[PDB]
Design a protein around this ligand. Structure first.
Ligand code: M7D
Length: 377
């Protein structure tokens, strides 16, 4: 069920704070592009016209295998938007599963506030399900097509390392060398986003003590396309108050807790131990069982490049659309998106940033009753 996937180890790169990307090729002969790994969307969208932030793009007229689907697509986000032309081409991942598949491609011809200056990615690989694909669910996502066309198991796993950044996307398997300890699995509640259920939250062991529906209002998802741990308004406010109280041996400006200002220390003297750990309990696979994943301040204090000082941004923030377990969560763990068994596994990542005295953790089981109640029905 696990093993060695040696070609896919260390295939992810990124700039600190701008996205984890994998190298892919599109077309014949192959055109190389860096593509953002994104579990919170479902389109394979690539830049396909010049743009000041893109130093290369998909040139359909140079690909003998390109097929025009003759239909536009317009995708607005909250901050940013793009428009493109639908088609297909042959697609590979050079440091991947050693197969070439024909996939749908949204060739981006126009955009605003979508490509990031200096991010070094020219497109996005949306790994979620068809239900949120644009323009609709008839456009099969990349991974659906890869599994149908090859013998690749219906599973992928992500190890995002953090502290420039790097990691691994294992297509079709679970690499045993990227984690320690047990893999603990939570159910995928519904196949659209990768939706999970949080049943309990602690700050340094102290229960936040809310109706567990508040943790999942109106949904809880696992999203590699988001930096922060994003929490509903009522949950975020309770969490910040508890983190303040636990770290009260040092006081910081209010703007730090809003993510608007950096706090610094003399290089090497960052006092990790005064900051608390953060635990999310996830619904288990067995009735009345949960497990918990625990991250450190090394995950939610994110480094920002005086060279003699280490400075950081607080990366827990408020969400209007439910909980988003972003890179802040995922960088503590090796996360298994087991689509075949409709579950998401977590294990202590073998590359996660920590100190001599604390590590990230995945522990279980715990008797948690009435866990279906925690879902926003
Ligand atoms: C397609 C979408 C998207 C993601 C991104 N990602 C980054 O810039 C990004 C930046 C840093 C990390 C990390 N460490 C990960 N990602 C950029 C554009 C975009 F359009 C839309 N969107 C809105 C909110 C969340 C999402 C999402 N999951 N994907």
């Amino acid at each position: 069920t696990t093993g060695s996937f040696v070609e896919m180890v260390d295939n992810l790169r990124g700039k600190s704070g701008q996205g984890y990307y994998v190298e892919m090729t599109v077309g014949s002969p192959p055109q190389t592009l860096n593509i953002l790994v994104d579990t919170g969307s479902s389109n394979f969208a690539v830049g396909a016209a010049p743009h000041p932030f893109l130093h290369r793009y998909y040139q359909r007229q140079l690909s003998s295998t390109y097929r025009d689907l003759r239909k536009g697509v317009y995708v607005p986000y909250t901050q940013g938007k793009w428009e493109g032309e639908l088609g297909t081409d042959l697609v590979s991942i050079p440091h991947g599963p050693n197969v070439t598949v024909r996939a749908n491609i949204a060739a981006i011809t126009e955009s605003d506030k979508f490509f990031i200056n200096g991010s070094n990615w020219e497109g996005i690989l949306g790994l979620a399900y068809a239900e949120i694909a644009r323009p609709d669910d008839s456009l099969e996502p990349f991974f659906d097509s890869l599994v149908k066309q090859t013998h690749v198991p219906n599973l992928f796993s992500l190890q995002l390392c953090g502290a420039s950044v790097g990691g691994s996307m294992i297509i079709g398997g679970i690499d045993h060398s990227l984690y320690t300890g047990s893999l603990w699995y939570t159910p995928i509640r519904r196949e659209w986003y990768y939706e999970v259920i949080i049943v309990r939250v602690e700050i340094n062991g102290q229960d936040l003590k809310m109706d567990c529906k508040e943790y999942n209002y109106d949904k809880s998802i696992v999203d590699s396309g988001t930096t922060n741990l994003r929490l509903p308004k009522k949950v975020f406010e309770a969490a910040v108050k508890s983190i303040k109280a636990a770290s009260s041996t040092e006081k910081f400006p209010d703007g730090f807790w809003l993510g608007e200002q950096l706090v610094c220390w003399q290089a090497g003297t960052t006092p990790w131990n005064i900051f608390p750990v953060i635990s999310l309990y996830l619904m288990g696979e067995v009735t009345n069982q949960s497990f918990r994943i625990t991250i450190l301040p090394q995950q939610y204090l994110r480094p920002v490049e005086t060279s003699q000082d280490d400075c950081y941004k607080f990366a827990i923030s408020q969400s209007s659309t439910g909980t988003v377990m972003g890179a802040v969560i995922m960088e503590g763990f090796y996360v298994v998106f087991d689509r075949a068994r409709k579950r998401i596994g977590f294990a202590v990542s073998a590359c996660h940033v920590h100190d001599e005295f604390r590590t990230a953790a995945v522990e279980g089981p715990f008797v948690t009753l009435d866990m279906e109640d925690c879902g926003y029905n």
